[PDB]
Design a protein around this motif. Structure first.
Motif, PDB file in Angstrom:
ATOM      1  N   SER A 242       0.825  -1.206   0.000  1.00 36.94           N
ATOM      2  CA  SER A 242       0.000   0.000   0.000  1.00 36.94           C
ATOM      3  C   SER A 242       0.858   1.254   0.000  1.00 36.94           C
ATOM      4  N   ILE A 246       1.571   4.137  -3.071  1.00 36.59           N
ATOM      5  CA  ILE A 246       1.259   5.558  -2.969  1.00 36.59           C
ATOM      6  C   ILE A 246       2.511   6.398  -3.198  1.00 36.59           C
ATOM      7  N   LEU A 262      -5.474   5.255  -8.747  1.00 39.07           N
ATOM      8  CA  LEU A 262      -6.092   4.435  -7.699  1.00 39.07           C
ATOM      9  C   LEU A 262      -7.608   4.388  -7.843  1.00 39.07           C
ATOM     10  N   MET A 267     -11.772   2.795  -4.376  1.00 45.03           N
ATOM     11  CA  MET A 267     -11.299   2.726  -2.994  1.00 45.03           C
ATOM     12  C   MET A 267     -12.456   2.809  -2.009  1.00 45.03           C
ATOM     13  N   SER A 317       4.685  -1.053  -7.113  1.00 45.87           N
ATOM     14  CA  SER A 317       4.740  -1.818  -5.877  1.00 45.87           C
ATOM     15  C   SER A 317       6.057  -2.553  -5.665  1.00 45.87           C
TER      16      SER A 317
ATOM     17  N   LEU B 198      -2.557  -2.262  -9.608  1.00 45.35           N
ATOM     18  CA  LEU B 198      -3.277  -1.568  -8.550  1.00 45.35           C
ATOM     19  C   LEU B 198      -4.510  -2.321  -8.052  1.00 45.35           C
ATOM     20  N   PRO B 201      -3.636  -3.618  -4.226  1.00 48.85           N
ATOM     21  CA  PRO B 201      -3.636  -2.592  -3.174  1.00 48.85           C
ATOM     22  C   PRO B 201      -4.968  -1.891  -2.992  1.00 48.85           C
ATOM     23  N   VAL B 202      -5.829  -1.867  -4.006  1.00 50.28           N
ATOM     24  CA  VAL B 202      -7.135  -1.231  -3.870  1.00 50.28           C
ATOM     25  C   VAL B 202      -8.196  -2.224  -3.417  1.00 50.28           C
ATOM     26  N   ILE B 207      -6.699  -2.432   1.552  1.00 47.83           N
ATOM     27  CA  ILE B 207      -7.353  -1.169   1.231  1.00 47.83           C
ATOM     28  C   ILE B 207      -7.399  -0.262   2.453  1.00 47.83           C
ATOM     29  N   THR B 210      -4.129   1.486   2.266  1.00 43.99           N
ATOM     30  CA  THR B 210      -4.122   2.304   1.056  1.00 43.99           C
ATOM     31  C   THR B 210      -4.984   3.545   1.231  1.00 43.99           C
ATOM     32  N   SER B 247       7.670   2.020   3.783  1.00 46.70           N
ATOM     33  CA  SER B 247       7.468   0.805   3.013  1.00 46.70           C
ATOM     34  C   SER B 247       8.703  -0.081   3.064  1.00 46.70           C
TER      35      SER B 247
END
Ligand code: GUE
Ligand code: GUE
Lengths: 357, 350
Positions: A242, A246, A262, A267, A317, B198, B201-202, B207, B210, B247
Motif C-alpha cells: 500500500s 502511494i 487508484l 477505494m 509496488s 493496482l 492494493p485497492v 485497502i 491504502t 514501506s
C-alpha cells in the motif's frame, strides 16, 4: 565550537503567511536565526550567513547580534574555520545543493554539513559526490540538525540527528555526531539519533502523512490480528505494498496521477467491506468519510486527475530493498552507488520540475 | 457466455472464523459460489469446480444448482469450454499456480484467466510465462474479477478488472476486458477498470492502509495549501519520501523493525508542530492520540521491537520507480514482473 548557520528564516513567512506567534507561539526571529542565537547563548562561536541580512529590521538584528551571532552575506568567508555547517536553506531551485557545494572546499578539516527541514541528507550527499572527489573533502561528514519544529517556538525541544544506521556506507563519524549532540544538549534540546534516511520522514512537515500512515498500518494490523485472523506475513506484505504504491505514484505522476490511477470510487467501494468494527477502526471510518466528500475539499486536484493520462509505464509496488539487492548482483557496487545517486537526484528534479504553472 | 468459477469458498471461514452475516450481512453461501449463482441468474452458462463439493451441505448445494450452476470436481473438464475462468482459489499452498497451470492448455481459444484477492494477476502471469510459451497459449488473457468484498454480502456491488494501464506489454485484450465488464454489468455490479498492479492494493484487505495513507496524503496537501502556503513540489517530495521509507522498513525489517527504527517518541514530538487546525486535520489528531497509547494496543509488537536489531543495511529511501527503470534497462520487463512474483511468494507462501 565554531558553528555557521546558513539561512536566517524568512521573517515575512513566519508572520504574514503563517502566523507563528498565534499558531505555535514564541516571538520572532524564528528559524536558523533562533538556532544561532541559542548556540551563541550557550557559548559557541556562531556565524550566520544569509543574502538578505540588510532586509532584517534593526530591532530584530540587534537582538541576534547582542547574543553573539556574527551576521554576514559572504557564504564562503562564513565557512572558513567552521566545524559545523547547518543548512537552513531553501528546498527550491537546488539552493541547498548549491550552497553546500560553494562552502565545501572552505570548511575546516573534519567539518560536518547538516541539513534541516528542507532537504534530506542522503539526497544532498548524492549531489555533492563529484565535488567531494574533485576537492578531496572525503573528511567532511554529513548529518542533520532537524528541529522537527520551528526554532524559536516552545514546541522546538529537540533535534533529529542522522546516524549511519541502515546505511551501506557511512556518511558521518562518531566525533562529528558528538558535536551535534553537544549543540543540542548545550541548548536544552533532546537529541533523537535516527537512521539518516528516517530523519526527514519523522521531522518534516510531512510527519502528517508519516504518522497517519504509520497509525493506519497499526490499525490494519489490529483488524488483521483480531477480526480477520490472517497471517502476520500477509499483513506485512499488504502494508508495504500500500505505502510503496502511494509513494511511487506520487513520485512519478504526482497527486493528480495518484488520484486518477487508484480511483477514489473504487477505494470507497472496496473499503466498505473492511469497516468491520467501527469502534476499533477510527482511522478507517474517518478516511471513508473523507473520501466521500473529496470532490468538495480538493476540487482542483479532482479536475487535474480527470485530465491526467500516464505517459510512461512503471511498476508502483516493487520494493526498493529487492530492487537494490537484485542490482547488487547485476552490476558492481561501484556502479550501483552511481545509480542510487542518479535516482535520488532524479527524484528531486522530477518532483520539483513537475511543478509547472 | 461460458463461465467457470474455480472455488466454492470456505463455508467454515465465513461463519466460524469470520461471522460474515453479523459483521457484513447477507446469507451463505459466500464467495465463488455466490458469484457463480449471480452469473447463472444473468443467463450465462456457469460451471463451478471444487474438490470438496461433496462436503457442501445439501440445502446450500441445492440453492446453487437450482440457479443453473453446474457443479463438478474435475478442474480440467470445467476448463474445456470456459471463455472466462475465475480463480476463487486459496491463499496459501501455491494451489492457484497449480490450478492455473493445469487448465492452461485446455481453455478455449482467447479465454481469459481471472484472479481474485488471493493472487495478484501480474504474479500469476509472471509465473506462467514458460507455460504460455511451451503450450502456445499466447492467446490467453490475464485479468481479474476481484470483488473487493465478500460475494454474497450487500457490500459486493462492484468488480475490479485489471487492465494493461502502466504495463509495458499487454496481458489481456480489449475484447477480453469487455467480456469481464459485461459479466459485472449483467449482474448489476459496477466495473472499475484499474491498472493490473493496482487491483491488489485497492481491492485486497490492505485497502485499509491504502485508503488511510491516501487520505493522510490529501490531508497534508490541504494543510500545505490552506495553512502552510508551501509549494506543491515540496509537499509531494515529502509524501513520496516518507511513504517510501516506511514501506522499505516494513519489507526488510517487518513491523517490529519499523517501530524500533522510526522512534514513536520522535514522531509524537515532531507532530506537535503540525497540528495547526484540529478541525481541518481529523486524521492527524486521531493519529496523534493513537501514538500515545501504542504500548497498550500492540504490546506483542513492542516486545519484538525491543529485541530487534537490523542485520543487513538497505537504502530505505531509494526511490522505487527510478530503480525500476534502471532495472528495466539492464535486464528487461520479465525480470521486473518476476520481482513482483518473488515479493508475493515471500509473504503468501511457506
Ligand atoms: N514537524 C515540523 N517540521 C517542520 O519542518 C515544520 C513544522 N513542523 N511546522 C510548520 C513549519 C513551517 N515549515 C516550513 C518550512 C519550509 C517552508 C518553505 O516554503 N521553504 C521554501 C523557501 C521559500 C523561500 O523563501 O524561497 C523552500 O525551502 O523551498 C515553509 C514552511 C516547516 N515547519
Ligand atoms: N475490500 C476487501 N478486500 C478483501 O480482501 C476483504 C474485505 N474487503 N473484507 C473481508 C474479507 C475477508 N478477508 C480475508 C483476508 C484474509 C483471510 C485469511 O488469511 N484466510 C486464511 C486463513 C483462514 C483461517 O483463519 O483458517 C486462508 O484462507 O488461508 C481471510 C479473509 C479479506 N477480505
Amino acid at each position: 565550537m565554531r558553528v555557521t548557520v546558513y539561512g536566517f528564516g524568512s521573517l515575512n513567512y513566519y508572520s504574514n503567511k503563517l502566523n507563528v506567534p498565534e499558531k505555535l507561539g514564541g516571538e520572532p526571529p524564528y528559524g536558523g536565526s533562533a538556532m544561532a542565537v541559542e548556540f551563541a547563548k550557550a557559548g559557541h562561536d556562531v556565524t550566520l550567513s544569509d543574502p538578505n541580512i540588510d532586509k532584517v529590521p534593526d530591532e530584530i538584528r540587534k537582538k541576534v547580534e547582542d547574543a553573539g551571532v556574527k551576521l554576514t552575506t559572504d557564504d564562503i568567508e562564513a565557512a572558513k574555520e567552521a566545524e559545523v555547517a547547518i543548512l537552513f536553506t531553501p528546498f527550491r531551485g537546488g539552493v541547498t545543493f548549491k550552497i553546500a557545494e560553494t562552502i565545501l572546499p572552505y570548511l575546516v578539516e573534519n567539518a560536518v554539513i547538516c541539513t534541516t527541514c528542507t532537504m534530506s541528507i542522503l539526497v544532498l550527499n548524492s549531489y555533492l559526490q563529484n565535488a567531494i572527489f574533485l576537492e578531496g573533502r572525503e573528511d567532511i561528514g554529513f548529518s542533520t540538525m532537524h528541529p522537527a519544529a520551528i526554532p524559536g517556538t516552545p514546541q522546538h525541544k529537540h533535534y533529529l540527528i542522522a546516524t549511519n544506521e541502515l546505511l551501506r556506507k557511512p556518511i558521518v563519524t562518531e566525533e562529528q555526531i558528538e558535536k551535534l549532540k553537544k549543540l543540542a544538549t548545550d541548548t536544552g534540546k533532546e537529541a533523537y539519533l535516527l537512521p539518516a534516511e528516517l530523519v526527514s520522514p519523522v521531522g518534516d512537515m510531512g510527519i502528517v502523512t508519516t504518522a497517519i500512515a504509520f497509525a493506519g498500518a497499526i490499525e490494519y494490523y489490529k483488524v488483521s490480528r483480531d477480526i480477520l485472523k490472517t497471517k502476520r506475513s500477509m499483513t506485512e506484505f499488504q502494508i508495504a505494498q500500500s505505502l510503496q504504491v502511494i509513494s511511487s505514484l506520487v513520485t512519478k505522476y504526482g497527486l493528480e496521477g495518484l488520484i486518477k490511477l487508484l480511483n477514489v470510487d473504487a477505494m470507497k467501494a472496496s473499503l466498505q467491506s473492511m469497516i468491520l468494527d467501527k469502534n476499533e477502526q477510527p482511522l478507517t471510518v474517518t478516511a471513508s468519510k473523507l473520501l466521500e466528500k473529496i470532490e468538495e475539499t480538493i476540487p482542483e486536484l479532482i479536475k487535474e486527475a480527470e485530465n491526467f493520462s500516464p505517459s510512461e509505464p512503471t511498476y508502483t509496488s516493487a520494493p526498493s530493498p529487492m530492487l537494490v539487492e537484485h542490482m547488487e548482483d547485476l552490476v558492481g557496487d561501484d556502479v550501483l552507488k552511481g545509480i542510487l545517486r542518479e535516482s535520488w537526484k532524479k527524484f528531486y528534479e522530477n518532483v520539483s520540475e513537475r511543478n509547472k504553472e
